[PDB]
């Protein structure tokens, strides 16, 4: 368990892809969000000791046209959960 931001290209757009494809999950009715999906993203892996988990939290900020957004991805184990949900962005 230790890491953080990596790149500033796909790493961001990535969440954007699953963003609209997952926006439904955490929520109920997804929408359009491809205006400006990026913002200061970040990621943090989560490995046990001998490969008992090896999770990864993907936090992306989707700055769409209608406004600024952001989702949170987490895929850990041992006492975690794997899936994309978060999709907000306060002001």
Coordinates of N, CA and C in Angstrom, one line a residue:
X1 N 0.8 -1.2 0.0 CA 0.0 0.0 0.0 C 0.8 1.3 0.0
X2 N 1.1 1.8 -1.2 CA 1.9 3.0 -1.3 C 2.1 3.4 -2.8
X3 N 1.8 4.6 -3.1 CA 1.9 5.1 -4.5 C 1.3 6.5 -4.7
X4 N 0.9 6.8 -5.9 CA 0.3 8.1 -6.2 C 0.3 8.4 -7.7
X5 N -0.1 9.6 -8.1 CA -0.1 10.0 -9.5 C 1.1 9.4 -10.2
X6 N 0.8 9.1 -11.5 CA 1.9 8.6 -12.4 C 2.1 9.4 -13.6
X7 N 1.1 9.5 -14.5 CA 1.2 10.3 -15.7 C 0.1 11.4 -15.7
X8 N 0.0 12.0 -16.9 CA -1.0 13.1 -17.0 C -1.7 13.0 -18.4
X9 N -1.6 11.8 -19.0 CA -2.3 11.6 -20.3 C -3.4 10.6 -20.2
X10 N -3.2 9.3 -20.4 CA -4.2 8.3 -20.3 C -4.7 8.0 -18.9
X11 N -3.8 8.0 -18.0 CA -4.1 7.7 -16.6 C -5.3 8.5 -16.2
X12 N -5.5 9.6 -16.7 CA -6.7 10.5 -16.4 C -7.9 10.0 -17.3
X13 N -7.7 10.2 -18.6 CA -8.7 9.8 -19.6 C -9.3 8.4 -19.2
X14 N -8.4 7.5 -18.8 CA -8.9 6.2 -18.4 C -10.1 6.2 -17.6
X15 N -10.1 6.8 -16.4 CA -11.2 6.9 -15.5 C -12.4 7.4 -16.3
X16 N -12.1 8.3 -17.3 CA -13.1 8.9 -18.1 C -13.9 7.8 -18.9
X17 N -13.2 6.8 -19.4 CA -13.8 5.8 -20.1 C -14.8 5.0 -19.3
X18 N -14.3 4.4 -18.2 CA -15.1 3.6 -17.3 C -16.0 4.6 -16.5
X19 N -15.7 5.9 -16.6 CA -16.4 6.9 -15.9 C -17.9 6.9 -16.3
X20 N -18.1 7.0 -17.6 CA -19.5 7.0 -18.1 C -20.0 5.5 -18.1
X21 N -19.2 4.6 -18.2 CA -19.6 3.2 -18.2 C -19.8 2.7 -16.8
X22 N -19.3 3.4 -15.8 CA -19.5 3.1 -14.4 C -20.4 4.1 -13.7
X23 N -20.5 5.3 -14.2 CA -21.3 6.4 -13.6 C -22.6 5.8 -13.1
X24 N -23.1 4.8 -13.8 CA -24.4 4.2 -13.4 C -24.3 3.4 -12.1
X25 N -23.2 2.7 -11.9 CA -22.9 2.0 -10.7 C -23.3 2.9 -9.5
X26 N -22.3 3.6 -8.9 CA -22.4 4.4 -7.8 C -23.8 5.1 -7.8
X27 N -24.1 5.6 -9.0 CA -25.4 6.3 -9.2 C -26.5 5.4 -9.7
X28 N -27.4 6.0 -10.4 CA -28.6 5.2 -11.0 C -28.7 5.5 -12.5
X29 N -28.5 6.8 -12.9 CA -28.6 7.2 -14.3 C -27.4 8.0 -14.7
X30 N -26.5 7.3 -15.4 CA -25.3 8.0 -15.9 C -25.7 9.2 -16.8
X31 N -24.6 9.8 -17.4 CA -24.8 11.0 -18.3 C -23.6 11.2 -19.1
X32 N -23.5 12.3 -19.8 CA -22.3 12.6 -20.6 C -21.2 13.3 -19.8
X33 N -20.0 12.9 -20.0 CA -18.9 13.5 -19.3 C -17.6 13.2 -20.1
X34 N -17.4 14.0 -21.2 CA -16.2 13.8 -22.1 C -15.7 15.2 -22.4
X35 N -16.2 16.2 -21.9 CA -15.8 17.6 -22.2 C -14.3 17.8 -21.8
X36 N -14.0 17.6 -20.5 CA -12.7 17.8 -20.1 C -12.4 16.8 -18.9
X37 N -12.3 15.5 -19.2 CA -12.0 14.5 -18.1 C -10.5 14.3 -17.9
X38 N -10.1 14.8 -16.7 CA -8.7 14.7 -16.4 C -8.4 15.2 -14.9
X39 N -8.0 16.5 -14.8 CA -7.8 17.1 -13.5 C -6.7 16.3 -12.8
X40 N -6.1 16.9 -11.7 CA -5.1 16.3 -10.9 C -5.5 14.9 -10.4
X41 N -5.3 13.9 -11.2 CA -5.7 12.5 -10.8 C -4.6 12.0 -9.8
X42 N -4.7 10.7 -9.6 CA -3.8 10.0 -8.7 C -4.2 8.5 -8.5
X43 N -3.3 7.7 -8.1 CA -3.5 6.3 -7.9 C -2.6 5.7 -6.7
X44 N -3.1 4.7 -6.0 CA -2.4 4.2 -4.9 C -2.6 2.6 -4.9
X45 N -1.5 1.9 -5.1 CA -1.6 0.4 -5.1 C -1.7 -0.1 -3.7
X46 N -2.1 -1.3 -3.5 CA -2.3 -2.0 -2.2 C -1.9 -3.4 -2.2
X47 N -0.6 -3.7 -2.0 CA -0.2 -5.1 -2.0 C 0.0 -5.6 -0.6
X48 N -0.3 -6.9 -0.4 CA -0.2 -7.5 1.0 C 1.3 -7.7 1.3
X49 N 1.8 -8.9 1.0 CA 3.2 -9.2 1.3 C 3.7 -10.2 0.3
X50 N 3.0 -11.2 -0.1 CA 3.4 -12.2 -1.1 C 2.4 -12.3 -2.2
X51 N 1.7 -11.2 -2.5 CA 0.7 -11.1 -3.5 C -0.7 -11.7 -3.0
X52 N -1.0 -11.3 -1.8 CA -2.3 -11.7 -1.2 C -3.4 -10.7 -1.6
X53 N -3.1 -9.6 -2.2 CA -4.1 -8.6 -2.6 C -3.7 -7.9 -3.8
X54 N -2.7 -7.0 -3.7 CA -2.2 -6.2 -4.8 C -3.3 -5.4 -5.5
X55 N -4.0 -4.5 -4.6 CA -5.0 -3.7 -5.1 C -4.5 -2.4 -5.7
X56 N -5.4 -1.5 -6.1 CA -5.1 -0.2 -6.7 C -6.2 0.7 -6.7
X57 N -6.1 1.9 -6.0 CA -7.1 2.9 -5.9 C -6.9 3.9 -7.0
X58 N -7.9 4.1 -7.9 CA -7.8 5.1 -9.0 C -8.7 6.2 -8.8
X59 N -8.1 7.4 -8.4 CA -8.9 8.6 -8.2 C -8.7 9.5 -9.4
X60 N -9.8 9.8 -10.1 CA -9.8 10.6 -11.3 C -10.7 11.8 -11.2
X61 N -10.4 12.9 -11.7 CA -11.2 14.1 -11.7 C -11.7 14.4 -13.1
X62 N -13.0 14.1 -13.4 CA -13.5 14.4 -14.7 C -14.2 15.8 -14.8
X63 N -13.4 16.7 -15.4 CA -13.9 18.1 -15.5 C -14.7 18.2 -16.8
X64 N -16.0 17.8 -16.8 CA -16.8 17.9 -17.9 C -17.3 19.3 -18.2
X65 N -18.1 19.5 -19.2 CA -18.5 20.8 -19.6 C -19.6 21.3 -18.6
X66 N -20.6 20.5 -18.3 CA -21.7 20.8 -17.4 C -21.1 21.2 -16.0
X67 N -19.8 20.8 -15.8 CA -19.2 21.2 -14.5 C -18.0 20.2 -14.3
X68 N -17.4 20.3 -13.1 CA -16.3 19.5 -12.7 C -16.7 18.3 -12.0
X69 N -16.2 17.1 -12.3 CA -16.5 15.9 -11.6 C -15.3 15.1 -11.2
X70 N -15.5 13.9 -10.7 CA -14.4 13.1 -10.2 C -14.9 11.8 -9.7
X71 N -14.3 10.7 -10.1 CA -14.7 9.3 -9.6 C -13.5 8.7 -8.8
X72 N -13.9 7.7 -8.0 CA -12.9 7.0 -7.2 C -12.9 5.5 -7.4
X73 N -11.8 4.9 -7.9 CA -11.7 3.5 -8.1 C -10.9 2.8 -7.1
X74 N -11.3 1.7 -6.6 CA -10.6 0.9 -5.6 C -10.8 -0.6 -5.8
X75 N -9.7 -1.3 -5.8 CA -9.7 -2.7 -6.0 C -8.7 -3.4 -5.1
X76 N -9.0 -3.5 -3.8 CA -8.1 -4.2 -2.9 C -8.7 -5.5 -2.4
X77 N -8.0 -6.1 -1.4 CA -8.4 -7.4 -0.8 C -8.0 -7.5 0.6
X78 N -8.5 -8.5 1.3 CA -8.2 -8.8 2.7 C -9.3 -8.3 3.6
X79 N -9.9 -7.2 3.1 CA -11.0 -6.6 3.8 C -11.4 -5.3 3.0
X80 N -11.4 -5.5 1.7 CA -11.7 -4.4 0.8 C -12.8 -4.7 -0.2
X81 N -12.9 -3.9 -1.2 CA -13.9 -4.1 -2.3 C -13.3 -3.6 -3.6
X82 N -13.7 -4.3 -4.7 CA -13.2 -3.9 -6.0 C -14.3 -3.4 -6.9
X83 N -14.1 -2.2 -7.4 CA -15.1 -1.6 -8.3 C -15.0 -0.1 -8.4
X84 N -15.6 0.4 -9.5 CA -15.6 1.9 -9.7 C -17.0 2.4 -9.2
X85 N -16.9 3.6 -8.5 CA -18.2 4.1 -8.0 C -18.1 5.7 -8.0
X86 N -17.4 6.2 -7.0 CA -17.3 7.7 -6.8 C -17.5 8.4 -8.1
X87 N -18.1 9.6 -8.1 CA -18.3 10.4 -9.3 C -18.9 11.7 -8.9
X88 N -18.1 12.5 -8.1 CA -18.5 13.8 -7.7 C -17.4 14.8 -7.9
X89 N -17.6 16.1 -7.5 CA -16.6 17.1 -7.7 C -17.1 18.4 -7.1
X90 N -17.0 18.6 -5.8 CA -17.4 19.8 -5.1 C -16.7 21.1 -5.7
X91 N -17.1 22.2 -5.3 CA -16.6 23.5 -5.8 C -15.8 24.2 -4.7

